[PDB]
Each structure stands twice: as structure tokens, then as C-alpha cells.
Amino acid sequence: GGKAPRASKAA
Amino acid sequence: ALPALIHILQNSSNDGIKQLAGVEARKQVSKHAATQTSVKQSLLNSAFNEGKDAVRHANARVIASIGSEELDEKKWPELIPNLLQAACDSNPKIRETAIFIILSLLESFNANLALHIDDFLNLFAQTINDSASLETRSLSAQALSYVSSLIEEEGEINPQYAAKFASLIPSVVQVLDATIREGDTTNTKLIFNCLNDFLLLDSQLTGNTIADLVKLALQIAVNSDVDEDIRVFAVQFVTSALVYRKSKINQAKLGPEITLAALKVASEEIDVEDELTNEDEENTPALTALRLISNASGELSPSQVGVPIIEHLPTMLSSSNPFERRSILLAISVLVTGSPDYTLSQFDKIIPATVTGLKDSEAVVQLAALKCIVQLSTNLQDEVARYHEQYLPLVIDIIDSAKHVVIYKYATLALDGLLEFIAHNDIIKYLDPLMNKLFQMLETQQSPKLRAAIVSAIGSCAFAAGSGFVPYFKTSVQYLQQFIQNVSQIEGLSEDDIELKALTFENISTMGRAVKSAAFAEYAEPLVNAAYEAIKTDSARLRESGYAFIANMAKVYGKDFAPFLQTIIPEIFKTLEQEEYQVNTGIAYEKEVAAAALSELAIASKEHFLEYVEPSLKVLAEQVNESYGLKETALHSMWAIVKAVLLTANLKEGEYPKGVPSGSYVDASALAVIQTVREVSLNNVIEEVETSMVISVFQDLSEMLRLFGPIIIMDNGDSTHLDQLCREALSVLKGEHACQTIEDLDASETEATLLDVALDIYVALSTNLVGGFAQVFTTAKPVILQLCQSKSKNKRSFAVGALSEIALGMRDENPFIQELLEALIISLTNDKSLEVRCNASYGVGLLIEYSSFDVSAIYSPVLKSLYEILSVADEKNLAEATKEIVDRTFSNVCGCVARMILKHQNLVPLEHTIPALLSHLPFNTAFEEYDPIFKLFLKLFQEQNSTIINEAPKVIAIFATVFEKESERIELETNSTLGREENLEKRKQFQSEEIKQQVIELLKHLNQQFNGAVAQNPVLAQVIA
């Protein structure tokens, strides 16, 4: 929930 | 007017007619004089004497509807007493029809039946075990569902009633056993409905049974002697218990048995040739089980579901039973959606397993692996992509030699999802062969299902390739233009025909994002006209594709697209107000995309959208109140409208004034828009029982606050909404929120995400308010510090990471640095998780950097831990914990050490520390941690410190990589597809332009001293001059 990490072509 | 239907019912010589009138007579009972008593008796005789049950039942239901009506007052007081009598009669057939009539009465829901709950409890306690009629036993179980609803209607659960009702639950299990032994599948299903209704009951009525009901349903589900349809009932029941009573399942630690039971059913033989060619039964056991694993993965912790699956992956994947090989692969594909983070951590096992599946002789196994890969890509998008060098050859080979249509679709679909997320630089190696293969494939395949899969894969090449797609742009639209002729003529087209046009509209718009407005100009006008044709069409899928085209148009043209608002906003408005029931899934999907289009248009139109703000917020607010599946997306678009207004007022992202606002840094009109959406956002979090709703609101509020500051939640010195927001967020941390309550318990990934998004409110408010946040942080601080101690690894990670980020927001104005520093050192020193110690070290350096009190006592222990953590990551580097984590730990540890050297150089012995720092440089990830390291290099070299001065060659090499990486980033920045800027900040090598100039200025100094060492390197010679 801090430094360590926890959309694209489609819509 | 009505009695006619009864006479036909008694008398009709043809037997079906007697029945057909009874069905109508029941319907017509309510509307429809002295001889209402003559009609009662005629029915009762027919209902106990008629030959065939169907006519008996026809008569009985009419009797019950009469009884409910003839119970306005005490109009038929003997009915219930007589039926209670007949149900105890010596004649089993008389008892059976009596219970059947009592069941029909209970089906009337007449409020007066609550007057008789004790009667029914006493009668059903006997008739449930009737030894003469299994039908009578089943009807009694069916009747018990209604009696329970009555006891719960009462103000207070009668304790005596619920004890009687709970005593009957083992009897219903005995009926279920009986119906299965006799083969009465009709009644077996009915008893399963009774078991399903027990799930919803208050715990006082059910006793401690629900867990044992689950255990029993599993015994039935795994037993292949039992008929297929009965086993589906059991799988469904356990799947139903995960939704409505997962607390009970957790208490029994039933997650692993459920998972393994579902795994064994999933391994059962299925119709291979149907799977391979029939384009999409989930009422056969093996498929129903997959729905069970999927639901289990969503509701429970990965230790209860994901771990059991991964433990069985090695033995099942090498089994000689292809259906076991198929099963474990499909088990993973359904696990990834509810447990994405757990699945990602098992990639060291899962990626090789999917590769083995693609290599299998049996196509059913190959199809499974491809479904698994598809599923992984959708969920964990770029992570799967990085393994393209292994996948792409294997997937292309399958396409080239596929013998079945469904393998061809899933191989093309697997290629589509991989290419969609491949790094821009890696796609360049493949782009020409992919392009020619896809168009070679588009030519060969005439099936519209296969062409739709290919067109999507082609659009994924353009998306990944950006500007590198220009050489293919014209020829692609030339070819694809054929699939978008006669857009308006939607009659005589199949569902797949509609989809092939829709995908072509969507992927051509994706090509405009890849090659921008200049290369799109040739076809912009005809394509936009066709997209409007689609918007007017009667196909919701086709309208959805039109809105997707326009949304991407907004990205390409910005304000230049503003003259189209007047026509388009009314088409979007019509779409959003549609009735949503046939639910009509096409309309739900259409509403989602139209909402995205409306948001994209608002952002691009800038000033031109103001006249639409009030109406757009009116339509969107209505959908939050009334829409069945669009609440989150509708609320999200309101915040997008706010973003559009605030950017139109030239409030720049991240450029808001810190601290609690006494008034407003936003004009009155923009403030009115903010307050409107801010009000709706709080209303959909307070007392909200949908956790996906609370998550969505907390995400929108976090993002808006980070972008535009505390004005999102507060203005004019009034903190009513801020206190509400923290009151709610603190509730989620405590586990006490309404969406939670339906302490150390193991949590699902969704439950943990809920925790993290509430923490994110605090992280964002701390950057907003700085020192002003301390008052609000006081309640959450003890809770968050306690969460740093959870038995949960992710929860300890979330809390420590959030404490570190909160430290960064409050900086030197933080009145709790000593207390927070003390907690994080304990985590840094004693935690067993590398990831937790990783996040801890970041906060430790930040807290030390911002501390203004004496830290000389903690430097030595902290530095010893910092060298030991370099030791546990070292071993891991050489050969739960991923490589990304390990690399981040190096970056964070080195950043922490640098921040300490910077703070109190005298306390750190540099002769050993500087080499340890250098040996882990350059970094592979977490380039934010360069910032203190660059600052340390600046200061050491400015002091001509001997330790660094001897290390000039390593320092020069580090900067060579830094500036090499920085230019690669700048090239990628310009060539990438529009709007793929998710990790734009993360690949930044410098946290500011000021520090970048200092490094350049330092590099120039290094050139004179050391006699041109710097310019020997081609990279730095370019930056030095």
C-alpha cells in the first residue's frame, strides 16, 4: 500500500 | 362470471381440460354470490377424489387462493383446522393432499398465516418423516421455507420457535437423502431449493448446520454414481453458500475442501469434440465446478483457494489423464480473476505450466492452456506480455496447424492479449511478420467469429506499436473498410456479423491513437460519419462501438473535436436513460462506453463543454440513483466532468495550495460543480453495503484529491464532508463498515483492496494538508499501527507502505515522527516478509530525514538491519517474493542509507557504506530512489570526499546508464500510442529538472578533473556539451 506497487485498449 | 371455470374443472370429460380451467380459475379468483359455500365443497371433493394428481393439484390451488381471499375477516375459520386434521389422517393419500393444500396457502403469503406458526411447526415436525409418502415429506420441507419466513417477520425471533425450526433441519437432510435414493430428481431439486433458502436465514433458526450442509453437498457433488443434474444442484449450493454465508465456511476452514472437491469434479471426462468445435453446458458437473472455483477465489483468501490449486499443479499437469491436465489449467484461468496478486506471485510455476499445456498432444489440453493465458492477460496485462518470446512462437504454431475452430479462436485471442501489452520496443522486432501473418489470416478465414478475433489482434499491434504502425495504417483501413460498409442496414445480419463490424470500428479508432491526427486525417471524415450512423442504429452493440470510436476520437483531436458536441451529447443522453431490462447486457455495455465517451469529450472540449456540465451531471446523477449496473461508472464520469471543469479553469494537476482551505482556490461556478459530486460521493459510501461501490468511491476521491487538493472534499473552512469521509474510511480500517459487516480473520484480495483504498484516502489527505493533517490522522494512527502487526502479509504491507507515504506527505511538520519511526524500525528489524521490510525501509529513511530530534541511538541498529536486508535480498537475487520486490528492496534500502548519510553524515562510516551503495547501482526499478543518491553524490563530490573521489569511474558509468535510460524514455514518450501514459512517472530517472541540471553541472566538473573521463563516454559527451 506504499512504495511496493499494488486501463488499456478497451473501453 | 368466474364460477364457470370451476365447472369445466370438475366435469370436462377430456382430462386435460379440467386442468386448463383450473389454471385459469386460480388466476381469476381475486376479481370474482350467496353460494360461495357450494363452490368450496365441490372443489374439496374433487381435490381428494380426482383420479390424477395434476387435476388434484389444479383443484387444490384454487382452494388456497379462495382461502387467502376468504380470510379478510374470519370468513372460513374451519379451513386451517380441517386441513391440520386431514394431514394427520390414517389415509396417506388424504395426508398428502392436505399438506399440498397447506403449501398453497403458505404460497399465498396471507398475513393471517402468521397466527398459526406453532401449528405448522408441530404438524411439519411430524409429516416431514411421513413413512408412507416421499411426496408428503418433500411438500413438508417445501412448506418449512414459508414457516421460517413467518417466524423472522416477528419483531423478536421467538426463541422457542427457532429451536423447533432448527430441530427440523436434520429431517430435511434425511428427505434429501431419500429422494436421491429413490431417484425422484424432481423432488431432489425442490429439497435443494429448501437448503438454498436456509442460507438466507437468521443464525438462530439454522443452528450450526450451514457448514455441515456444505460438507454434505460436497459428498453428493464428488460422487459420480449420482445423476449429473443432481450433482450440479450440489455444486450450485456450495457456490451459493460462498456468496451468502462465507463466514460460516471460513469458520469451518472449508475453503480447501471446497477447492479440492471442485478440482476433482472438474477433472471428469467431458465431450471433447463439442468443446473443440461448438462455439459457446454450465449445467454439467465439470463446468459448474469451474464456477465454484471462480466464486471461491473471489470470496476467500488465496491461502484457502489459490494455495490448494498450486499445490496440485505439479501432479495434475503431468497426469496421463488429459482431463486432469485440462482441469488444472482451467482451474488457474478461473483463479486469476479473484486472486490476481496471488496468481502473479506464482508465475514462476504458472508460466511454465501454461507453456507445457501448449506443448500437449491433446488439443483439449492445448485449448485449456490458451484459455488460461487469455485469462491471465486480461487480468494481469503486462505481466503476461513480458514472456512473449516463449509464447508467440508457440501460439503462432498452433494457429498454423489448428484443426478446430475454437482452438483457432483462442490462439488468435491469446495472441491478441499478448500483443496488446507488449512493450513498444519489443513489438518492433515482430511488427512486420505479425502484420503480414494477421492479414494472411484475415484473408484465409471467412468465419465471422474468426475474423473478429483477427481484427482485434491487428488492432493490438497498432496499440502497442504507436508511431511504428504508420507504414501499415493505410493498407489496414483499406482492407478493413469493407467490414464497415452499410452500417445502418442492420437487418439480415447475424450477431457475429454485428460484432465483426463493431470490432472494426473500435480497432480503427485504436489506430488513430497509435498514429495520431496527421496520419489519420485522410480517413477522419468518412469514419466519423460511419460512427454516427452506428450511434443511430437499433443494435446496442453497434451503438456501443460508435461511442468507443468517438471516445478515442476525443483523444486524437482534443478541442478540434468540439464542433461535434451538439449532435453527440443528445445521442449519449438517450443511451444513458434507456430502460435496462429485457437484464439487457448490450445496453449495459453500451451505457458504459457512452459514459466513457461523455467523459473523454468533456476533457477534450474544455471551455466548449460548460453548457453541458449541468445537464450531463443531471443525467449521470439519475443513473447513480436508478441504474442497476452503472452506478460506479456513472459516478466516475461525474468526477471526470469535474476534472474537465477544473482543467478548463487552468488548475493544473498537482498545483493546488496545500492546507485546509479557509475559502476557495477555485471560482464559485467550479466550486458548485465540485460540491454537487462531492455530495453524491458521500451519499454512496455512507451506510453502503456494496463493497465494490465503496471501493469505487474511495478510488475516485483519492484520485481527485491528489490531482486537485483538499478543495475536492472541503471548502470555506467547513469540514463536515471531510469528517464524514474519515469517519467512513476509519470504519473500513476497523472492519466495521456496513459493506464489511454482513478481527484477525483471513481476508480475500477484494477485502484487502478495500483496506488499501481507505488507507489511500489518508495517504492523499496527508499530502493535501501537510501539518494540517495531524488532527485527522490521530484516530486512524493507532488502527494503522495495529495493522502493521496483522497476521496478513498484504495488510502489514499496506499499512507500513501507507505509513511511509503519510510520512512523505507531512514532511517536517509531522508531530509523530518519533512514534512512527519507532514502529517502522520494528518492522524493518523483525518482519519475516521481504516485501514488508522493503516498504519499511522507505518510511524509515523518510522519517529520519524529517526528524528534528536526536536519532544517534537508532543509527547503528538500523544500519545493521539495512546491511542484513541487503543480505536476504542478495541470496534471492542470485538464484511469496518476486524479483521485482528484490530489486525494489535494493533501491529502497540504498535510498534509505543515502537519506541518513545526508541527514547526519558524522553518524555513518562511509568507507564501507559507499561501496555497498555503489555495488547496487545502477538501479533496475524504483528510480525515485535515485533522488537522494544523486543528492549524496553531489555533496560528497563537492567536498572532494576521498571515498567518492576514488569511485569516479563507477559514478561516471552509473550516469551513462541513467542518461541512456532517460533518452530511451524520451523517444518512447513521443512514439507511444496516445493515452498509454500509465507508468510515465515511474520510468523517470530524475524527480525534477533542477536535480537533472545539477547532475549535468556535476558531470561537467567531473570532465575537467579526471581529464575528460566524462566525454570518453558517447552518451555523456552528448549531455555534457
Numbering used by the authors:
A (entry chain C): 12 to 17, 21 to 25
B (entry chain A): 40 to 71, 77 to 324, 330 to 631, 658 to 817, 827 to 963, 968 to 1113
The publication says:
Kap123, the most abundant karyopherin in budding yeast, functions as a primary transporter for the H3:H4/Asf1 complex, whereas Kap121 acts as a secondary transporter. Kap proteins share the common structural motif of helical tandem HEAT (Huntingtin, elongation factor 3 (EF3), protein phosphatase 2A (PP2A), and the yeast kinase TOR1) repeats with a right-handed superhelical solenoid structure. Here, we report crystal structures of full-length Kluyveromyces lactis (Kl) Kap123 alone and in complex with NLS peptides of H3 and H4. We identify that there are two spatially separated lysine-binding pockets within Kap123 that specifically interact with H3- and H4-NLSs.
To examine how Kap123 recognizes H3-NLS, we determined the full-length Kl Kap123 crystal structure in the presence of a histone H31–28 peptide (1–ARTKQTARKSTGGKA PRKQLASKAARK–28) at 2.7 Å resolution. No major structural change of Kap123 was observed upon the H3 peptide binding with Cα root-mean-square deviations (RMSDs) of 0.4 Å. Although we used the histone H31–28 peptide for crystallization, only residues 12–17 and 21–26 of histone H3 (12-GGKAPR-17 and 21-ASKAAR-26) were clearly visible, indicating that H3 peptide residues 1–11, 18–20 and 27–28 were disordered in the crystal structure and not critical for H3-NLS recognition by Kap123. The determined structure revealed that the H31–28-NLS peptide interacts with Kap123 through two deep lysine-binding pockets separately located at the Kap123 inner concave surface. K14 and K23 of H31–28-NLS independently interact with two distinct and distal lysine-binding pockets, demonstrating that H31-28-NLS recognizes Kap123 in the bipartite binding mode. The first lysine-binding pocket (repeats 20–22) of Kap123 captures K14 of H31–28-NLS through both hydrophobic (Y926) and negatively charged (N980, E1016, and E1017) residues. The first binding pocket only allows small hydrophobic amino acids (Gly or Ala) as neighboring residues (G13 and A15 in H31–28-NLS) by making several backbone contacts. The second lysine-binding pocket (repeats 11–13) of Kap123 recognizes H3 K23 and makes additional backbone interactions with K23 neighboring residues (S22 and A24 of H31–28-NLS) without strong amino acid preference. Notably, the two lysine-binding pockets of Kap123 are distally positioned and the distance between the Cα atoms of two bound lysines (H3 K14 and K23) is 26.6 Å, indicating that more than seven residues are required in between two key lysine residues. This results in –XSH-K-XSH-(X)6 or more-K- as a consensus sequence for Kap123 recognition.
